[PDB]
Amino acid sequence: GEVRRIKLYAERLADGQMGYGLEKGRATIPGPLIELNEGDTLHIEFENTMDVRASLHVHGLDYEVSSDGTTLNKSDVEPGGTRTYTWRTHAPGRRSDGTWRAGSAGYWHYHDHVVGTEHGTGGIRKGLYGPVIVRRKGDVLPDATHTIVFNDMLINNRPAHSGPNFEATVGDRVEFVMITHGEYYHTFHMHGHRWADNRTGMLTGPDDPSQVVDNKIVGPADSFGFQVIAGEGVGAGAWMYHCHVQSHSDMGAVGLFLVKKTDGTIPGYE
Amino acid sequence: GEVRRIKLYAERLADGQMGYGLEKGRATIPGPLIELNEGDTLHIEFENTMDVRASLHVHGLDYEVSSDGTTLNKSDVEPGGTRTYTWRTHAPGRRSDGTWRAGSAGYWHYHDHVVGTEHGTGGIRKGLYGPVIVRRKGDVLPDATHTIVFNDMLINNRPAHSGPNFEATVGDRVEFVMITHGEYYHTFHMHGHRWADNRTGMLTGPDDPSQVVDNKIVGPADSFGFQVIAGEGVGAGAWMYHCHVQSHSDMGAVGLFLVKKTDGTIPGYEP
Amino acid sequence: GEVRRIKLYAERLADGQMGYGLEKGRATIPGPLIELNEGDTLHIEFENTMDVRASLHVHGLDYEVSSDGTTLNKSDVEPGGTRTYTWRTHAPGRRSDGTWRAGSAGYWHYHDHVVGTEHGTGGIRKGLYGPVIVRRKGDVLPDATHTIVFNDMLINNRPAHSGPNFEATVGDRVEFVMITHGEYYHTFHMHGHRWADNRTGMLTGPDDPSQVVDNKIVGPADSFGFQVIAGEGVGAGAWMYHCHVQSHSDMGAVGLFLVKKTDGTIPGYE
Ligand SMILES: [Cu+2]
Ligand SMILES: [Cu+2]
Ligand SMILES: [Cu+2]
Ligand SMILES: [Cu+2]
Ligand SMILES: [Cu+2]
Ligand SMILES: [Cu+2]
Ligand SMILES: [Cu+2]
Ligand SMILES: [Cu+2]
Ligand SMILES: [Cu+2]
Ligand SMILES: [Cu+2]
Ligand SMILES: [Cu+2]
Ligand SMILES: [Cu+2]
Ligand SMILES: [Cu+2]
Numbered sequence: 030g031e032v033r034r035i036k037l038y039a040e041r042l043a044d045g046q047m048g049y050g051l052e053k054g055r056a057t058i059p060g061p062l063i064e065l066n067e068g069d070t071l072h073i074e075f076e077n078t079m080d081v082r083a084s085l086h087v088h089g090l091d092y093e094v095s096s097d098g099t100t101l102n103k104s105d106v107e108p109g110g111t112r113t114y115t116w117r118t119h120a121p122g123r124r125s126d127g128t129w130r131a132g133s134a135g136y137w138h139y140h141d142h143v144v145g146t147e148h149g150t151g152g153i154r155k156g157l158y159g160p161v162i163v164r165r166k167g168d169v170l171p172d173a174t175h176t177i178v179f180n181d182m183l184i185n186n187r188p189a190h191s192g193p194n195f196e197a198t199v200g201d202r203v204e205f206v207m208i209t210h211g212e213y214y215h216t217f218h219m220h221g222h223r224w225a226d227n228r229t230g231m232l233t234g235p236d237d238p239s240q241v242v243d244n245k246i247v248g249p250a251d252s253f254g255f256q257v258i259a260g261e262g263v264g265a266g267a268w269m270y271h272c273h274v275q276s277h278s279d280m281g282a283v284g285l286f287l288v289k290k291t292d293g294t295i296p297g298y299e
Numbered sequence: 300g301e302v303r304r305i306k307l308y309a310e311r312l313a314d315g316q317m318g319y320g321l322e323k324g325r326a327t328i329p330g331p332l333i334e335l336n337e338g339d340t341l342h343i344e345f346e347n348t349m350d351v352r353a354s355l356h357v358h359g360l361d362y363e364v365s366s367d368g369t370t371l372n373k374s375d376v377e378p379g380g381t382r383t384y385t386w387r388t389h390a391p392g393r394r395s396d397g398t399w400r401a402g403s404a405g406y407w408h409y410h411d412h413v414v415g416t417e418h419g420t421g422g423i424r425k426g427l428y429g430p431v432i433v434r435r436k437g438d439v440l441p442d443a444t445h446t447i448v449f450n451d452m453l454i455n456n457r458p459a460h461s462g463p464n465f466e467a468t469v470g471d472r473v474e475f476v477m478i479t480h481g482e483y484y485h486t487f488h489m490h491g492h493r494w495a496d497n498r499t500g501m502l503t504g505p506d507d508p509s510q511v512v513d514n515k516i517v518g519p520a521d522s523f524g525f526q527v528i529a530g531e532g533v534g535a536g537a538w539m540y541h542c543h544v545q546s547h548s549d550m551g552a553v554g555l556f557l558v559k560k561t562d563g564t565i566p567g568y569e570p
Numbered sequence: 571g572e573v574r575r576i577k578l579y580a581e582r583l584a585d586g587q588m589g590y591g592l593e594k595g596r597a598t599i600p601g602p603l604i605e606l607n608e609g610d611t612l613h614i615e616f617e618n619t620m621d622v623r624a625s626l627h628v629h630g631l632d633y634e635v636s637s638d639g640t641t642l643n644k645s646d647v648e649p650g651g652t653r654t655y656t657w658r659t660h661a662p663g664r665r666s667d668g669t670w671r672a673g674s675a676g677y678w679h680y681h682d683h684v685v686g687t688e689h690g691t692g693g694i695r696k697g698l699y700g701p702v703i704v705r706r707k708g709d710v711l712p713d714a715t716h717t718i719v720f721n722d723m724l725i726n727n728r729p730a731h732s733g734p735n736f737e738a739t740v741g742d743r744v745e746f747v748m749i750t751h752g753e754y755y756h757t758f759h760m761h762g763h764r765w766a767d768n769r770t771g772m773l774t775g776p777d778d779p780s781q782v783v784d785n786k787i788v789g790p791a792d793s794f795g796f797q798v799i800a801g802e803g804v805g806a807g808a809w810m811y812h813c814h815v816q817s818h819s820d821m822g823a824v825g826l827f828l829v830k831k832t833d834g835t836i837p838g839y840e
Contacts, residue, residue, distance in 0.1 A: 086761075088784050091804055093804060094762075094805070094806075094808065094838055099810065101810060102808065126710075129772065129774065130799075130802070132782070148816060150816040150817075150819075153816065154816075169396075202396075214484050214518055216519050218520055220367060221367075223401065224401075225779075226781075228779055228781045231401070232391070232401045233399065233779045235391065236503075237779050238507050238509060241403075242359075243358050245521075246518035247787060248756070248814070248815065249816060250757055250759055250814035251757060252785070253781065258394075261400070262387065264363050267364065269369065273519045273520035275419075275481055276482055278420075296364050296365070296372070298372055439667070439669055484789055486792060488629075488791055491633070501670065502670045503670065507670070508773075510768055510769045510794065511675070511676050513629050513630055514629060514793070516755065516787060516792055532632040532658065532660055533634060536634070536638075537635065539640065543789070544753060545695075546691075548687075548689040548691075549689055555642075566635050566643070568643055569644060
């Protein structure tokens with residue numbers, strides 16, 4: 030695998046928010062998508078631009094305690110400080126004893142572990158979360174990737190009834206990364222589309238018995254993802270995704286997957 | 300791939316509830332079981348007999364936005380109004396891009412999307428939900444199918460501690476369709492029986508690594524199903540199923556899977 | 571296909587608790603680990619030493635209604651009474667209808683079903699739960715097994731912020747049994763390690779599409795397990811496990827998987 034180096038910044042944002050960015054003043058919630066192939070090493074030159082301690086902690090990937098991002102393992106970052114975190118990944122294969130070592134590939138996420146509490150409750154609430162995708166050799170690559178985070182009662186820390194919306198063309202291969210944070214369980218639902226409940230969100234072939242779903246229960250720090258063919262067997266349209274917990278959809282935990290015809294039109298909606 | 304047609308009616312019942320039915324005054328909660336084979340197209344000639352806007356929205360199956368059953372897609376039904384909803388299904392197969400297209404087959408459900416709120420909160424609460432099963436070629440068919448819906452704190456909108464109960468005989472292949480709605484997470488548990496956490500609820504063979512379970516966390520609009528051999532390795536008896544969230548079972552989210560001997564008898568129990 | 575016999579006692583414990591034990595005055599919370607191979611029968615000579623009715627109910631395994639442990643089937647135990655419960659297990663096999671009968675193998679649990687309520691709400695709250703593992707022929711056996719029960723807001727009925735901690739050496743094959751009870755949903759997370767969402771928690775091979783996860787939503791009476799190679803690809807250290815529901819980790823639903831180097835030392839303990 031390849032050795033990669035990136036910079037990452039934690040920054041305070043308007044309305045008491047906090048975000049990660051690849052450049053100063055370009056912090057976003059969710060944070061930037063990090064994509065790796067199994068075997069790749071990533072060195073993250075992390076700068077905490079804030080006035081409180083902050084950290085970077087990742088799910089799924091290989092890291093040593095020196096890159097835990099915790100007070101326990103003295104790997105958080107002082108205010109205005111810098112730390113180089115290292116994430117490693119590995120491909121699957123048989124061990125010496127004939128057991129199968131699972132690879133790093135999957136839909137994962139990174140977040141703060143020290144803002145507000147020693148579990149990053151305040152950091153997470155304020156927006157310090159982002160997606161990580163680790164791909165296996167031969168994995169099907171998409172035309173676009175969209176990240177949806179159910180953070181307490183908000184989506185991507187947007188005000189209620191505020192999307193986000195995602196645009197595609199009929200036939201586009203669209204990947205979704207779906208992360209949950211905070212206090213509450215949710216159920217993720219997408220109209221007119223469906224996926225497999227497995228590593229890639231896609232059945233491997235006819236021997237894969239994974240349930241095909243369009244609704245999934247998720248809790249804090251769950252991550253999954255999938256790919257769909259936009260509008261496959263259903264056509265162009267305003268295709269809602271929403272939390273299916275009835276009070277949550279009613280309070281505006283809803284967005285649109287806007288699937289246009291090749292001619293740029295979409296069947297008239299609202 | 301057969302093209303089929305049914306009539307469906309939304310009706311107000313007693314205790315203010317609301318139900319789907321195949322005939323006028325025959326509405327049930329849950330709604331009627333709709334069963335399709337992959338490839339089938341179903342045209343639902345729907346009539347809203349109620350004095351409020353209602354709709355039909357489906358999980359899992361192929362439909363165009365004109366059959367969304369939402370206000371967003373101008374697909375709900377005015378009071379007394381009619382609409383033909385079209386559901387399509389497909390078999391699995393190889394795409395030209397070399398990927399495997401997942402089929403429609405599964406345990407699915409349909410429900411209202413406009414009663415009370417633009418997400419059907421009032422309709423779902425009052426009973427406008429029912430099961431849909433899409434079968435793959437070669438799928439094993441059961442002796443009977445039973446639908447269990449955890450709707451907020453009730454089962455099938457029954458009052459607390461009033462079932463439903465389902466009866467079978469030892470050896471019967473019994474299918475359960477398990478749907479959840481409303482506000483709360485649940486855990487579905489059955490005494491004396493277990494199933495696979497996969498598409499059909501049954502392991503394909505010794506090369507299927509799916510967890511074998513008797514307890515499953517479910518949230519609103521989750522659906523799964525399974526088939527068991529009634530009493531297999533455990534015998535006839537009153538086999539409780541219940542939510543395993545302790546306050547929920549204590550409040551009466553409990554029913555009985557009554558498995559009889561081939562002589563029609565059951566070991567004595569005290570409900 | 572071994573017939574096994576054990577004695578089990580239900581007893582009141584200090585601090586308003588109740589537990590199962592293999593010997594009088596030796597009750598623990600969780601109760602003793604019961605391990606069976608598919609085909610084994612277990613006869614449990616159960617004695618209720620308490621002043622309230624109590625029972626033994628099991629998930630997953632084969633039992634007749636006479637061993638349900640319920641009020642419904644009159645198979646609980648009066649105060650000071652004794653009853654033999656029988657649990658059976660079976661190997662998988664091909665049915666005469668051509669379908670595959672799922673075996674008993676898996677991560678399971680037993681608990682009371684009649685203390686406090688006819689669903690055992692009081693018994694479970696006070697500590698009457700324990701793990702059951704049923705193995706399939708050829709299953710990989712671990713160096714150690716550790717049971718983590720999320721019981722309402724507690725782990726193993728320990729007071730908040732009280733572990734438990736589990737020690738291993740790098741390269742040990744360590745098995746976790748993860749059981750949930752009570753009123754609340756949880757998300758189980760382990761730093762530095764991951765497992766397969768399937769029967770054994772280990773991918774069978776390259777043909778297994780199971781998601782690889784480090785975070786799993788669980789609710790009352792859910793049970794799963796897995797094995798990890800301690801420190802595999804991540805090294806020695808204090809590896810936190812916790813509930814990832816943020817208020818739960820903040821209130822102390824946390825422990826340590828203490829992974830020692832071959833020499834005995836743990837980095838960050840100097
Ligand atoms: Cu943590
Ligand atoms: Cu939600
Ligand atoms: Cu829907
Ligand atoms: Cu985390
Ligand atoms: Cu919807
Ligand atoms: Cu419940
Ligand atoms: Cu049980
Ligand atoms: Cu729905
Ligand atoms: Cu029970
Ligand atoms: Cu928790
Ligand atoms: Cu973590
Ligand atoms: Cu139980
Ligand atoms: Cu010390």
